[PDB]
Amino acid sequence: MMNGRPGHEPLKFLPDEARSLPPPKLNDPRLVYMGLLGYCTGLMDNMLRMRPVMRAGLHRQLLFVTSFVFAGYFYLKRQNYLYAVKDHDMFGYIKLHPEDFPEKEKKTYAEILEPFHPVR
Amino acid sequence: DSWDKDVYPEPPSRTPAPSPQTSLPNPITYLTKAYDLVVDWPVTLVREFIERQHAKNRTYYYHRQYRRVPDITECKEGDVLCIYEAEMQWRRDFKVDQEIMNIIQERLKACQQREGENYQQNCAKELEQFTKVTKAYQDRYLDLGAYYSARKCLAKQKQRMLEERKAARQ
Numbered sequence: 001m002m003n004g005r006p007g008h009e010p011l012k013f014l015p016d017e018a019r020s021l022p023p024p025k026l027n028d029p030r031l032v033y034m035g036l037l038g039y040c041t042g043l044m045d046n047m048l049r050m051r052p053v054m055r056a057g058l059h060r061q062l063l064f065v066t067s068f069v070f071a072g073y074f075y076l077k078r079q080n081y082l083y084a085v086k087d088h089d090m091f092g093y094i095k096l097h098p099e100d101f102p103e104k105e106k107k108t109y110a111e112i113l114e115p116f117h118p119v120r
Numbered sequence: 121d122s123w124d125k126d127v128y129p130e131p132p133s134r135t136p137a138p139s140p141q142t143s144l145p146n147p148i149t150y151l152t153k154a155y156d157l158v159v160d161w162p163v164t165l166v167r168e169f170i171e172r173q174h175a176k177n178r179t180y181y182y183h184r185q186y187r188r189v190p191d192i193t194e195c196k197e198g199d200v201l202c203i204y205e206a207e208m209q210w211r212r213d214f215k216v217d218q219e220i221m222n223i224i225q226e227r228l229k230a231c232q233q234r235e236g237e238n239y240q241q242n243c244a245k246e247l248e249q250f251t252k253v254t255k256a257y258q259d260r261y262l263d264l265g266a267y268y269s270a271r272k273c274l275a276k277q278k279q280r281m282l283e284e285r286k287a288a289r290q
Contacts, residue, residue, distance in 0.1 A: 109274060110193040116275035119265030 002086060014074070018081035024073060031072050038068030127223065131234070186212065192270040210270035217257065224253050 002008075009015050024031060042061035046053050094101050140146065192206035231246040232239045259280065264272050 106196040106198050108194050108196050109271065112197065113278055114271060114275040116272065116279045117265075118263035118276070120263045 002082070002089070005085075005089065014078055014081065017085070018077065021077070021080055021084055024076050024080070026073065030076055031069055034072030035065050035069045038065040041068070128227065128230075130230070192274060207270050210273065214261070214268070217261065221253065221257060224250055 039061060042057065042064040043053050045060070045064075046056050051057060186209070189205045189209050190202060192203065192210065195202040195206050197203075228243070228246045228250045231243040235242040260273065260277070261268070264276065
């Protein structure tokens with residue numbers, strides 16, 4: 001739904017506005033889980049190739065973990081940009097059409113009469 | 121005694137003086153004297169030792185008091201912050217009322233056991249206090265359900281006041 005927005009560069013992974021966003025912390029649970037998935041992928045690959053599960057293919061396991069963390073970091077930055085621009089468009093549209101989003105006045109619990117349903 | 125007679129009232133004991141008509145010795149008096157000399161003296165000695173050890177290592181603790189947060193009646197609906205504060209205050213007052221009912225019931229039981237054969241006459245004020253606090257408790261807390269809350273208590277009070285006002289019309 002956000003592909004037709006104004007200023008949308010076509011097939012652009014990380015546009016320059018994403019540079020305004022704070023980057024992922026590089027030690028955060030999403031990237032740590034991505035590295036864990038890469039290590040699990042290496043272990044499962046060893047077990048399916050009938051190698052020793054952990055002490056075989058250390059370079060392969062390192063490459064799996066590194067590639068998973070790298071791809072996860074850049075994809076996470078892209079998704080952070082997408083959610084940020086979604087909230088930016090939502091807030092801008094709300095500010096542009098305030099008559100369709102009126103500030104409703106919530107009364108206190110002294111003028112409203114909630115019906116009482118006795119449990120007995 | 122950590123308790124006080126203002127909240128646990130007790131009439132003063134009226135024991136009669138012994139008037140032994142018989143010349144036989146009283147085995148109860150003999151056994152109470154022997155029991156004192158054998159049991160009560162070492163027990164009070166070790167208790168005095170424990171009390172002086174506590175006096176050597178004396179510490180204090182306090183009773184926590186909560187300020188009155190604004191009631192749920194001035195809390196706007198959908199404002200979960202003040203609603204949470206009022207709900208926690210209401211649960212606190214609910215627990216205090218439970219213990220108040222426990223105090224009143226314990227007082228009534230003490231009256232009944234003290235009077236014995238005269239409980240139908242001499243526990244009139246205790247039974248009246250129990251009845252009044254039971255009626256107030258039923259007016260504020262009864263039939264709320266398992267998910268009792270300040271909102272449900274307020275709705276019940278509003279319904280009861282509406283019924284009373286409609287009855288007061290005629």
